[PDB]
Amino acid sequence: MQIFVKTLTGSTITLEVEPSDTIENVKAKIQDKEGIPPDQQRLIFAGKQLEDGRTLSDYNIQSESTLHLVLRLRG
Structure with a gap:
C-alpha cells in the first residue's frame, strides 16, 4: 500500500506500508527519509494524533490517505 505524509514545507512524501504496520513503524520510515x-x-x-502502538488498519488508513507530520521540537 502507498500512503502520503504531508511535511512541514507543505510538500508530500510517499511511503510504502502495509495495513498491519504500527504508527511507530511509520515514524521509523519518516526518520529514514527525513532524519526527524x-x-x-x-x-x-x-x-x-495517532498512537505509536496501533496499526494503520486500526485507524482506517487506506491507499493514498494523507497523514500530516507535526514537529514536537521538545521531543
Whole structure:
C-alpha cells in the first residue's frame, strides 16, 4: 500500500506500508527519509494524533490517505 505524509514545507512524501504496520513503524520510515527522530514526530489523521502502538488498519488508513507530520521540537 502507498500512503502520503504531508511535511512541514507543505510538500508530500510517499511511503510504502502495509495495513498491519504500527504508527511507530511509520515514524521509523519518516526518520529514514527525513532524519526527524520518532520522539519529535506526531502524526495526525482524521482530526486526531495517532498512537505509536496501533496499526494503520486500526485507524482506517487506506491507499493514498494523507497523514500530516507535526514537529514536537521538545521531543
